[PDB]
Ligand SMILES: *[C@@H]1O[C@H](CO)[C@@H](O[C@@H]2O[C@H](CO)[C@@H](O)[C@H](O)[C@H]2NC(C)=O)[C@H](O)[C@H]1NC(C)=O
Ligand SMILES: *[C@@H]1O[C@H](CO)[C@@H](O[C@@H]2O[C@H](CO)[C@@H](O)[C@H](O)[C@H]2NC(C)=O)[C@H](O)[C@H]1NC(C)=O
Ligand SMILES: *[C@@H]1O[C@H](CO)[C@@H](O[C@@H]2O[C@H](CO)[C@@H](O)[C@H](O)[C@H]2NC(C)=O)[C@H](O)[C@H]1NC(C)=O
Ligand SMILES: *[C@@H]1O[C@H](CO)[C@@H](O[C@@H]2O[C@H](CO)[C@@H](O)[C@H](O)[C@H]2NC(C)=O)[C@H](O)[C@H]1NC(C)=O
Ligand SMILES: *[C@@H]1O[C@H](CO)[C@@H](O[C@@H]2O[C@H](CO)[C@@H](O)[C@H](O)[C@H]2NC(C)=O)[C@H](O)[C@H]1NC(C)=O
Ligand SMILES: *[C@@H]1O[C@H](CO)[C@@H](O[C@@H]2O[C@H](CO)[C@@H](O)[C@H](O)[C@H]2NC(C)=O)[C@H](O)[C@H]1NC(C)=O
Ligand SMILES: *[C@@H]1O[C@H](CO)[C@@H](O[C@@H]2O[C@H](CO)[C@@H](O)[C@H](O)[C@H]2NC(C)=O)[C@H](O)[C@H]1NC(C)=O
């Protein structure tokens with residue numbers, strides 16, 4: 001499960017190893033040891049071997065530094081993402097889809113890991129669905145009624161209004177609907193009774 | 200001297216407001232690169248070619264080629280990772296019903312075409328024609344191209360499943376199991392999402408469907424006509440070609456030696472200096488390979504950033520409705536549709552744009568019976584002689600009653616409060 | 632399309648990818664032998680769309696998932712004189 005973090009560690013180790021292994025290359029010189037070159041050659045002709053060795057080792061170290069800079073940029077991007085997630089999923093509730101887990105985000109908990117962070121996301125998943133017949137508006141007394149905050153459903157014989165994410169049927173009244181226009185504009189309107197709680 | 204734009208002055212005052220009276224459905228496009236080419240390099244064939252006597256001297260330079268192979272293999276696997284994390288955002292391969300009636304909305308230009316063997320949409324076919332021997336010549340020098348893991352048909356299948364899910368279920372399939380809903384009711388939910396009431400959609404359904412169909416047709420025509428709309432993808436191709444060409448051009452540079460061909464170097468002069476010139480050529484070619492790998496790494500990092508942005512947009516504009524400004528187009532975001540393009544993705548964003556604004560007088564509160572009244576959900580407007588209350592993004596005046604206002608305090612604190620009547624619906628019923 | 636594959640039996644079923652060969656071809660160790668197949672994108676599903684039908688959930692589930700992000704890496708220091716000249 002913790003591969004990503006391990007990958008980071010492994011990468012660094014590899015780099016160091018490679019650098020050490022570059023100390024056994026002679027880069028076209030007669031030997032890989034400076035002491036041998038200086039003790040076997042006279043200085044006017046011993047400069048070319050030392051030049052070759054120095055240039056090769058400088059090139060290796062420069063390559064190491066460049067690879068490190070690129071990796072540091074990537075790690076910085078990851079840490080910026082982690083900081084944004086700490087702000088928006090642990091210190092609040094997020095409406096962005098799939099940002100703080102799969103489902104409707106409820107909350108998050110942070111944990112520390114070697115060189116990293118772990119987020120536990122708690123979300124809400126709907127389940128156990130049923131089929132219903134639905135209409136856009138209800139016709140009553142020549143007027144068109146729309147649900148204030150729900151949706152009209154039918155179980156086969158009678159019409160109710162429910163909230164959209166959890167099934168909870170209720171009687172259609174003038175307190176959970178509003179009127180706009182008449183019954184000859186909306187496509188698919190159905191006839192039913194709207195209950196007045198006052199008369 | 201370049202001009203920055205056209206000057207405009209807004210008619211600000213203490214009690215003037217502008218309310219839109221119409222709207223427009225807009226569809227716009229966004230192009231994002233996702234992946235780049237996967238290349239492999241053969242050290243021995245590039246540096247020394249066919250001369251095996253050259254291949255012997257390479258062993259005295261350490262592990263310089265294993266490192267380059269490692270870097271290129273990392274880039275290669277990262278490309279497939281990018282594509283997978285952009286396009287494989289669903290678990291079920293959803294299908295669209297055989298009947299293609301969705302309340303008047305057409306959708307035919309973005310749905311797959313069964314006649315063609317590729318099963319691509321009409322718009323997707325046009326994209327794959329705009330974005331487009333040397334390959335064998337480069338192959339004969341140690342430079343090869345690896346095929347991507349997902350084919351074009353599989354990516355088309357992924358986009359088709361995303362489209363079917365979003366057309367039949369709304370945003371429910373991105374948070375769990377897919378729940379079916381009629382399309383006009385979906386778009387009424389989205390109108391609620393942007394702050395407009397449902398009746399506005401249900402009373403203008405034909406006009407909105409016609410506007411959407413016209414916008415999609417215009418997108419098709421504009422893509423067919425303008426050739427420079429896909430330059431974001433083309434650059435990704437071009438930057439590859441140059442990178443290879445330069446590499447080839449480094450195989451004819453002397454690097455200070457007598458000539459570029461090493462066989463003539465071996466056949467002309469004595470080994471004591473042949474070693475020197477061979478070493479010069481080897482160092483030059485190794486340096487060129489290292490440079491190529493370095494800019495390849497930097498380009499891969501940039502492409503990874505672009506692909507992360509594309510995956511976020513797939514999550515937030517296609518699988519949901521976004522309140523972030525300008526993230527899913529210009530306007531108030533309604534929905535989005537994905538299309539696959541060579542090495543990239545195209546998003547068609549459908550947004551709502553207000554139109555035909557009108558001037559009105561306005562007040563913060565209404566004074567009645569020594570009490571201050573504030574609107575519950577809208578704003579108070581005056582057409583000159585009468586006062587109404589309306590919703591903020593669409594002109595629809597209504598009488599001021601106690602059902603669409605609320606009371607707080609008296610008329611001695613609010614600056615700019617006006618006098619009017621608040622109608623009580625209980626008294627007419629009581630007296631009748 | 633990636634080349635010539637030797638030592639694997641091609642089967643006509645589809646599974647989730649194990650070892651990517653390329654061009655939609657993956658390989659796995661099953662049965663026991665090594666097989667090559669075309670990867671499956673997912674399970675088939677169809678949604679019952681109609682003029683006036685809606686689906687509404689009656690229950691829910693509380694789900695907890697994990698996300699792992701790297702934050703920092705190792706801090707290294709190099710001495711030129713000892714690495715190059717010893
Ligand atoms: C739809 O729901 C209504 C709920 O009111 C059901 O009507 C009730 O059914 C019960 C049977 O368990 C009766 O005891 C009640 O008297 C009924 N109410 C009324 C007002 O008559 C109705 O049966 C349901 N329809 C279906 C097909 O399940
Ligand atoms: C809902 O009720 C209205 C009237 O209450 C129905 O309208 C009638 O439709 C018939 C057609 O069969 C006409 O002959 C009548 O003149 C109409 N009446 C009025 C007052 O306009 C309407 O048909 C009903 N809805 C449905 C779906 O049947
Ligand atoms: C309404 O706007 C006008 C300007 O269009 C304001 O007029 C002057 O505003 C300054 C700012 O403090 C005052 O010192 C002046 O006394 C105002 N002029 C007059 C004739 O009153 C005006 O103040 C604004 N309304 C309110 C209530 O401040
Ligand atoms: C709102 O705008 C739409 C178009 O954007 C208007 O519908 C057009 O009306 C004119 C009449 O002047 C017709 O010629 C066009 O054919 C209509 N367009 C379409 C697409 O049908 C509509 O009238 C505007 N609303 C108001 C109240 O003016
Ligand atoms: C309601 O149900 C379906 C889904 O759109 C439609 O049924 C098909 O509609 C097309 C378009 O008119 C016809 O060509 C087909 O013959 C219909 N097939 C069947 C099996 O009904 C139906 O038309 C929709 N309602 C409306 C008003 O279009
Ligand atoms: C949906 O859009 C397609 C394409 O815009 C329409 O097909 C066109 O229909 C007209 C009239 O029949 C023809 O002149 C065009 O040649 C057709 N174009 C293509 C590409 O086939 C189609 O009529 C629209 N409506 C429906 C219900 O499919
Ligand atoms: C709302 O009222 C303002 C104020 O008069 C109008 O702005 C003026 O528009 C005319 C255009 O004929 C310009 O000549 C003036 O310079 C504008 N005045 C200012 C202060 O900018 C505005 O056009 C009106 N809007 C509507 C829809 O009627």
Ligand SMILES: *[C@@H]1O[C@H](CO)[C@@H](O[C@@H]2O[C@H](CO)[C@@H](O)[C@H](O)[C@H]2NC(C)=O)[C@H](O)[C@H]1NC(C)=O
Pocket residue numbers: 582583584585
């Ligand atoms: C502002 O709106 C009010 C209410 O809509 C207008 O009053 C109506 O005007 C029409 C046309 O002049 C008459 O047919 C109605 O009888 C009026 N109703 C009432 C209750 O007076 C008013 O005319 C509009 N005023 C302006 C300046 O546009």
Ligand SMILES: *[C@@H]1O[C@H](CO)[C@@H](O[C@@H]2O[C@H](CO)[C@@H](O)[C@H](O)[C@H]2NC(C)=O)[C@H](O)[C@H]1NC(C)=O
Pocket residue numbers: 566616617618
């Ligand atoms: C709204 O009505 C109240 C009461 O009718 C007004 O308050 C009066 O203001 C005049 C100023 O000309 C005073 O002479 C009266 O003594 C006030 N009466 C009371 C009971 O306070 C108020 O001015 C009106 N609103 C506006 C904007 O004029």
Ligand SMILES: *[C@@H]1O[C@H](CO)[C@@H](O[C@@H]2O[C@H](CO)[C@@H](O)[C@H](O)[C@H]2NC(C)=O)[C@H](O)[C@H]1NC(C)=O
Pocket residue numbers: 690691
């Ligand atoms: C909603 O789902 C929960 C489980 O997530 C149901 O509770 C379980 O019901 C089964 C069957 O009766 C029992 O064996 C379990 O002990 C219950 N609890 C758990 C934690 O599983 C619950 O009954 C469902 N609600 C409805 C209305 O069916």
Ligand SMILES: *[C@@H]1O[C@H](CO)[C@@H](O)[C@H](O)[C@H]1NC(C)=O
Pocket residue numbers: 129130131679686
């Ligand atoms: C709704 O009915 C269809 C048949 O038209 C069925 O396939 C589907 O499973 C039903 N949905 C639910 C949630 O039972």
